[PDB]
Design an enzyme around this catalytic site. Structure first.
Site, PDB file in Angstrom:
ATOM      1  N   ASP A  25      15.442  27.613  19.887  1.00  0.00           N
ATOM      2  CA  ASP A  25      16.335  28.038  18.802  1.00  0.00           C
ATOM      3  C   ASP A  25      17.796  28.223  19.225  1.00  0.00           C
ATOM      4  O   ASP A  25      18.210  29.229  19.807  1.00  0.00           O
ATOM      5  CB  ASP A  25      15.750  29.315  18.209  1.00  0.00           C
ATOM      6  CG  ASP A  25      16.427  29.757  16.937  1.00  0.00           C
ATOM      7  OD1 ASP A  25      17.629  29.462  16.730  1.00  0.00           O
ATOM      8  OD2 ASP A  25      15.740  30.414  16.118  1.00  0.00           O
ATOM      9  N   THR A  26      18.638  27.239  18.902  1.00  0.00           N
ATOM     10  CA  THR A  26      20.049  27.212  19.247  1.00  0.00           C
ATOM     11  C   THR A  26      20.889  28.173  18.426  1.00  0.00           C
ATOM     12  O   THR A  26      22.055  28.449  18.740  1.00  0.00           O
ATOM     13  CB  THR A  26      20.641  25.788  19.074  1.00  0.00           C
ATOM     14  OG1 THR A  26      20.489  25.334  17.725  1.00  0.00           O
ATOM     15  CG2 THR A  26      19.883  24.829  19.971  1.00  0.00           C
ATOM     16  N   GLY A  27      20.286  28.698  17.374  1.00  0.00           N
ATOM     17  CA  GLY A  27      20.925  29.699  16.526  1.00  0.00           C
ATOM     18  C   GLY A  27      20.825  31.101  17.097  1.00  0.00           C
ATOM     19  O   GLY A  27      21.600  32.010  16.760  1.00  0.00           O
TER      20      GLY A  27
HETATM   21  N1  G4G Z   1      21.292  38.604  18.315  1.00  0.00           N
HETATM   22  C1  G4G Z   1      20.407  37.654  18.678  1.00  0.00           C
HETATM   23  O1  G4G Z   1      20.353  37.222  19.826  1.00  0.00           O
HETATM   24  C2  G4G Z   1      19.462  37.133  17.680  1.00  0.00           C
HETATM   25  C3  G4G Z   1      19.693  37.356  16.296  1.00  0.00           C
HETATM   26  C4  G4G Z   1      18.766  36.860  15.343  1.00  0.00           C
HETATM   27  C5  G4G Z   1      17.612  36.131  15.763  1.00  0.00           C
HETATM   28  S1  G4G Z   1      16.514  35.550  14.525  1.00  0.00           S
HETATM   29  O2  G4G Z   1      15.183  36.015  14.984  1.00  0.00           O
HETATM   30  O3  G4G Z   1      16.970  35.920  13.189  1.00  0.00           O
HETATM   31  N2  G4G Z   1      16.504  33.847  14.530  1.00  0.00           N
HETATM   32  C6  G4G Z   1      15.285  33.156  15.024  1.00  0.00           C
HETATM   33  C7  G4G Z   1      14.337  32.874  13.829  1.00  0.00           C
HETATM   34  C8  G4G Z   1      14.050  33.926  12.895  1.00  0.00           C
HETATM   35  C9  G4G Z   1      13.181  33.606  11.801  1.00  0.00           C
HETATM   36  C10 G4G Z   1      12.603  32.314  11.636  1.00  0.00           C
HETATM   37  C11 G4G Z   1      12.878  31.269  12.564  1.00  0.00           C
HETATM   38  C12 G4G Z   1      13.739  31.587  13.659  1.00  0.00           C
HETATM   39  C13 G4G Z   1      17.745  33.242  13.947  1.00  0.00           C
HETATM   40  C14 G4G Z   1      18.325  32.043  14.712  1.00  0.00           C
HETATM   41  N3  G4G Z   1      17.580  30.858  14.201  1.00  0.00           N
HETATM   42  C15 G4G Z   1      17.147  31.104  12.800  1.00  0.00           C
HETATM   43  C16 G4G Z   1      17.351  32.630  12.543  1.00  0.00           C
HETATM   44  N4  G4G Z   1      18.437  32.873  11.534  1.00  0.00           N
HETATM   45  C17 G4G Z   1      19.851  32.440  11.676  1.00  0.00           C
HETATM   46  C18 G4G Z   1      20.777  33.390  12.420  1.00  0.00           C
HETATM   47  C19 G4G Z   1      20.470  34.767  12.493  1.00  0.00           C
HETATM   48  C20 G4G Z   1      21.381  35.599  13.212  1.00  0.00           C
HETATM   49  C21 G4G Z   1      22.560  35.045  13.783  1.00  0.00           C
HETATM   50  C22 G4G Z   1      22.837  33.656  13.735  1.00  0.00           C
HETATM   51  C23 G4G Z   1      21.937  32.825  13.021  1.00  0.00           C
HETATM   52  S2  G4G Z   1      17.886  33.640  10.111  1.00  0.00           S
HETATM   53  O4  G4G Z   1      19.064  34.086   9.375  1.00  0.00           O
HETATM   54  O5  G4G Z   1      16.677  34.403  10.324  1.00  0.00           O
HETATM   55  C24 G4G Z   1      17.370  32.187   9.217  1.00  0.00           C
HETATM   56  C25 G4G Z   1      15.998  31.828   9.254  1.00  0.00           C
HETATM   57  C26 G4G Z   1      15.545  30.670   8.565  1.00  0.00           C
HETATM   58  C27 G4G Z   1      16.480  29.949   7.802  1.00  0.00           C
HETATM   59  C28 G4G Z   1      16.053  28.679   7.104  1.00  0.00           C
HETATM   60  N5  G4G Z   1      14.844  28.623   6.549  1.00  0.00           N
HETATM   61  O6  G4G Z   1      16.820  27.736   7.063  1.00  0.00           O
HETATM   62  C29 G4G Z   1      17.848  30.270   7.793  1.00  0.00           C
HETATM   63  C30 G4G Z   1      18.307  31.421   8.488  1.00  0.00           C
HETATM   64  C31 G4G Z   1      17.386  35.892  17.148  1.00  0.00           C
HETATM   65  C32 G4G Z   1      18.304  36.400  18.113  1.00  0.00           C
END
Ligand code: G4G
Ligand code: CL
Lengths: 99, 99
Positions: A25-27
């Site tokens: 997860d690059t996000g």
């Molecule tokens: N602070 C940190 O390090 C940190 C923060 C937060 C997390 S996270 O657990 O939330 N996490 C993984 C995740 C969570 C749940 C399902 C699959 C994967 C995020 C990164 N990749 C997707 C997640 N999201 C985007 C995000 C969150 C926070 C900062 C930047 C980007 S989101 O808003 O849950 C989202 C979900 C799904 C969708 C979609 N369906 O398109 C869009 C948006 C991890 C680490």
């Protein structure tokens, strides 16, 4: 390997002697795993995104194997709905985005 | 290009004629943008984040550019922490993870 994004990029990892499935997860800035025991000191933090925030315990200097790649880094542990490998460990295995 | 992960993979996108900063997020199945106006009819969609599921607006066949690469696809609009380019559009522009 070159991993397609037609499907979630899921890998097996080894941590704490246990095998688990995790999402590349690059996000995510940091790695986040479901509740598990880990050795050493930790400190609490909150992480969040769509739908809200959860409380996690931050462990540092944790050893992890990802796809047969050994790395060291921070691991957050808490009620996440999915196991995540974040940038903090993706960099260590040399992972890049390419198009 | 090739994008390393020591910092957030933030890129410039163009949608509805405006440049915006967005995050390449392989953990996101879909593309979710900050509140904005888009043409046409929308459909309801549930997405799940760290903290739970939420409802957002789904617009189909929207033109969008990612780092100058043109695409047309599904774009969600809702309370996201940042503009997110997820797997549906990453796949379309030919993006893979590599190590
Ligand atoms: N602070 C940190 O390090 C940190 C923060 C937060 C997390 S996270 O657990 O939330 N996490 C993984 C995740 C969570 C749940 C399902 C699959 C994967 C995020 C990164 N990749 C997707 C997640 N999201 C985007 C995000 C969150 C926070 C900062 C930047 C980007 S989101 O808003 O849950 C989202 C979900 C799904 C969708 C979609 N369906 O398109 C869009 C948006 C991890 C680490
Ligand atoms: Cl699409």
């Amino acid at each position: 390997p070159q991993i397609t994004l037609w499907q979630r990029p899921l890998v097996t990892i080894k941590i704490g002697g246990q095998l688990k499935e995790a999402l590349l997860d690059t996000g995510a800035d940091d790695t986040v795993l479901e509740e598990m025991s880990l050795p050493g000191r930790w400190k609490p933090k909150m992480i969040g995104g769509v739908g809200g925030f959860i409380k996690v315990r931050q462990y540092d200097q944790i050893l992890i194997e990802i796809c047969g790649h050994k790395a060291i880094g921070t691991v957050l542990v808490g009620p996440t709905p999915v196991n995540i490998i974040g940038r903090n460990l993706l960099t260590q295995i040399g992972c890049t985005l390419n198009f």
